[PDB]
Each structure stands twice: as C-alpha cells, then as structure tokens.
Design a binder for this molecule. Sequence first.
Ligand SMILES: C[C@]12CC[C@H]3c4ccc(OS(=O)(=O)O)cc4CC[C@@H]3[C@@H]1CCC2=O
Ligand SMILES: C[C@]12CC[C@H]3c4ccc(OS(=O)(=O)O)cc4CC[C@@H]3[C@@H]1CCC2=O
Ligand SMILES: C[C@]12CC[C@H]3c4ccc(OS(=O)(=O)O)cc4CC[C@@H]3[C@@H]1CCC2=O
Length: 545
Amino acid sequence: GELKVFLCALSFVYFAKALAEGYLKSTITQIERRFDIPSSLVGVIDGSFEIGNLLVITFVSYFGAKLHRPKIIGAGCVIMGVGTLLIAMPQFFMEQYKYTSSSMWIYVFLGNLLRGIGETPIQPLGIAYLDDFASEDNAAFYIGCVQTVAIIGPIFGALLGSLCAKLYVDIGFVNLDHITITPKDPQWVGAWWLGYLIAGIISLLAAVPFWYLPKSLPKIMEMARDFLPSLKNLFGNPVYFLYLCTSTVQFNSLFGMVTYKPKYIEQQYGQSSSRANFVIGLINIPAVALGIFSGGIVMKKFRISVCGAAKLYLGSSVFGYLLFLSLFALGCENSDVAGLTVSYQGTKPVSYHERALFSDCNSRCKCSETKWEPMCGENGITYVSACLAGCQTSNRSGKNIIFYNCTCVGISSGIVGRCQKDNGCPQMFLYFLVISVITSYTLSLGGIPGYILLLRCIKPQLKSFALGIYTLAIRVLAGIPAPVYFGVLIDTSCLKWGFKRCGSRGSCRLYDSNVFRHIYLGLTVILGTVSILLSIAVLFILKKN
Ligand SMILES: C[C@]12CC[C@H]3c4ccc(OS(=O)(=O)O)cc4CC[C@@H]3[C@@H]1CCC2=O
Ligand SMILES: C[C@]12CC[C@H]3c4ccc(OS(=O)(=O)O)cc4CC[C@@H]3[C@@H]1CCC2=O
Ligand SMILES: C[C@]12CC[C@H]3c4ccc(OS(=O)(=O)O)cc4CC[C@@H]3[C@@H]1CCC2=O
C-alpha cells in the first residue's frame, strides 16, 4: 500500500512540475507575440532554470540516495513551489497597468533558479525509490505511468495559460467594471501572474504526502571519499556508458525535431501558428504519452528481460526513423512570392542574385524593405507588402481588406494574407499528420525500455547517481545544444528576415521550402541513424555479457 501511495504522490509531483513548465512556456510564447522582450532576456530566463538544475543535480543525486529520499523529494517540491510563486511577485509591486529591464527581473530570475533547483531530486531519487521497492515486472509499469504523467502535464499548463490570458491583468486589484477593453483589443493584457500562483500552490500541495512516506519499504565524509570511485564504476560499466551515448544522440535528434516541428508545419504546409500548435499539443503529445504507457505495459505484461528491452528499444528507434524518412516525399513547393521565390513577371525558380523587392511596377511607391505585411493577389502570386504590389486604394469589407489598382498584380485586386498552397498541399499535410503521429508513437514506444536498460545493468546502490548523471548528460549535451545548431542550420534557409521594434533581427518570415525540409528532416534522420548504430552496439554487448 505504501508503494502505491508513493507512486501517486510522485505522479502528482510530476504533473505539478510539468504544468508549471507548460504554463511558463505558453505564457512566454504569447507574451512574445503581443509584447516585445529582447531575445537575450528570455534566454536568460530560460538559462536560469538550467544553471539552477545543473549545479545541484549531481550533488542531490549522489548524496540523497542514502538519505531520506521521500523527504528530499518533498523539500524539492517546496522549493519548486516557492520559486514558482516568486515569478508572479512583480505584479504585486508594479503599478496598475495603464493603457524595460531594471530591478524587477531579479524576482523572475530567482524564481526560475529555485524552480530549477527544486526540480533535481524529483526524477533520480523518485525513480530509484520506485525501482528499489517494486517488483521487477511492476517497476517498468510504474516508470511508464510516471513518464506518461510527465508528458501529458504541459497540455494542462498550456490550457491554464490560455485561461489566464483570457482574464484581465488587474483582476482582484482593480474594479473590472471600469475596464472597457476586450481580449481582442491590441492593448489588452492578460493575468499572467495568476497561473504562476496556481502552479506554486499545486507544487506546495504536492509536497505534503512525502512527509508521511517511510525512508524504505520491506557519514558525509565517506560519501565524499566514495564519490570518485563511483563515477569511474558507472563509466567503467560499458552497457551504461553506451546507452548514455545512445540516448544523448537520440535526444539530440528528438529535441531538434520537437523544437522546430511547429515552424516546419507553418512554413512547409502553410498552416497558421495556432493550427501548428494545436496539431502538436493535442495530437502528437497524446501519441507520445500513449507510446510511453504502451511500452511500460508491454514490459510488465510479458515479463520482458533486459535483452528484450534492448531489442524493443532498437526496434522502436528503427521503425520510428524509418517512418520519419517517409516525410521527405510529403513536401509542398515554395509559395509564389514576388521577388523572393518568383520574379514580378511570374517566372519560376529565381536565383539568389535576383532578389528584387523593388521593381518597375512598384517604383512609383516608396516602400519599406524591412516590413513584412504579406498580401495575396488575384493572380495567385503573394507579395511582400501591399505597397510592393503597386496598390493605390484599400477598402475594408467586413473582416477583410481588399486592395485595388495594384500595378504589379495586373501585369487587379488582392486580399490580406498569403495565398493558399493549391496543388495538393493540404493532402500532403494530412499525410504528414498521420505519419508524424505514428512516428511519435513508435519513437515513444522505446522510452521505458531504455529507462529499464539504464537501471538493470548497474549495481543497485548507484541507481540515483546513474539517473542524475543521465539527466545531466541529456540536459547538457542534448537539451541545450540541439535547438541552437538546428536553428542555425534552419536559419541558413531563410529568404526574408523580419525585424523587432529596436531593429534587432526577429524570426524569419519566409523560408525556402525545399532547403528547410531537407535540413530539418536530414539532421533528425542522421542523428537517429547514429543512435540506431549505438543501440545495436548496446544490444551486442548485452548479448556478449
Ligand atoms: C516574463 C513575464 C512576462 C512579462 C514580464 C515583464 C514585462 C515588462 C516589464 O516591465 S518593466 O519595465 O518593469 O521591466 C516587467 C516584467 C516583469 C516580469 C514579467 C513576467 C514574469 C513572468 C512572465 O511571463
Ligand atoms: C504592463 C507592462 C507592459 C506590457 C505588459 C504585457 C503586454 C502584453 C501581454 O500579453 S497578453 O497576451 O497577456 O495580453 C502581457 C503583458 C503583461 C504585463 C506587461 C508589462 C509589465 C510591466 C509593463 O510595463
Ligand atoms: C518520450 C520522449 C519525450 C519527447 C517525445 C516526443 C515529443 C514530441 C514529438 O512530436 S512533436 O510533434 O509533438 O514535437 C515526438 C516525440 C517522440 C518521442 C520523444 C521522446 C522519446 C524519449 C522521451 O523522453
């Protein structure tokens, strides 16, 4: 009974942590779309959690294995909740919002730092406690349930972020009857702070059950001395080392795939950002959670050994990246954009040295080069801005704006937005959706077999330390670097760069579909192939030993 209570408490803690991270990400994403924060500052906010987690993950993982693990998890939850509550602090000190970096971001930085610090004991100590006292058949199932809760959590965080953004910022502080603005108003400001308070309260509540859980189920100097031999023992173990390398390469592939999958959908298939986020959050993430749970259930039900676990991991990786290779055939060509993909004469592929945002048809109009306000003409050719199309008059009809007397279009009306991709791209998008869902499920099928691989070949006293080292390696070598170079190589395929209000380079507005697809899919597939080779090596060594 105590083991089930611990499992429920750990699942609730995972849910709270995932909800907090999801709310942070979703809130920052919307804030980036309405407000203007320089990318360096949001990068600092992201990196504070990182340094806080990395500085203490190894210390906690090594020195908390022999201590009261449930109580250390409870303390970590309390620290996480306190840090999350500290993020919403500035709202209580800033003046009432009336309708950019000084002495007020310290609260956010400290809150993210403490939230990263409190995060460290949850996974290594919790999973080690779960594995030590559960039977070998049920340990995989319990780990699968915990990871399934972890994957699903951020969906609720995003939902809470949306609900909070639908509320006014000064709710509770200012009489709302005097507010005449609606969420559709460009000056509307959401109650960003409310979700942080809710997440902090949930994290604090999650620490209560661990004060009543026992240390085990049916001094510092010595640990410091044994630390160095233990690290060599873990890295002297070839199964653990090679699985660590395999997971590092595979997560280098996976983080890069996940980070730029929204943008790939929007750019390759012409979908809006909302649709791209929807198909990922409510379709791909459930598939990932189902794959993890299915892997755990398969491990439990058929009593799969370590060799079978390695075989399942290898098969899941192989059949996931094989299906990911199928996405190469599901590609639409670049949309007709005048001056970047085609000339103003409607001539197909134009080269680099001919990027002619100014033409004869729009010489009479003094247009801005930096502004990206795309309009779709009656001739099916998208123009960078209405000025560049030679449009002289604009008429607002209903929710739409129609431009007339567009000189470039006549070589003459146009609507707001990009022209839709006509020749079978929605069908290609549907096939992409199906294959991507199946690929996500297949890749997630091996998440728990690899986790069991990590645990069943080390000496039982070093499970927490091995989990800590694994988490540190995944964060440092896969979590941090993979987005950076994926983005850089992807940015090499940009055709038109937007700018922020301060003149700094913003997100790219137009990519080259072919080059973008090639880079994005090829990097993922190559890293996956390297991971498959390493998994084959792991399986060979397991068979040898
Ligand atoms: C990062 C943030 C979005 C908006 C932020 C902000 C924006 C302008 C601002 O104006 S400032 O002149 O006081 O610097 C202060 C702040 C304080 C932190 C605040 C939020 C904390 C959580 C969050 O999602
Ligand atoms: C009031 C404010 C200016 C911009 C504000 C803003 C603007 C859009 C926004 O996006 S929204 O989706 O929540 O509507 C959120 C916020 C959150 C508060 C934020 C600042 C805090 C201090 C400040 O000077
Ligand atoms: C379960 C997992 C976390 C993230 C997972 C994921 C997340 C989004 C995704 O697709 S996505 O479009 O939603 O970005 C695919 C996948 C494939 C499996 C992948 C990992 C394997 C091991 C792991 O810890």
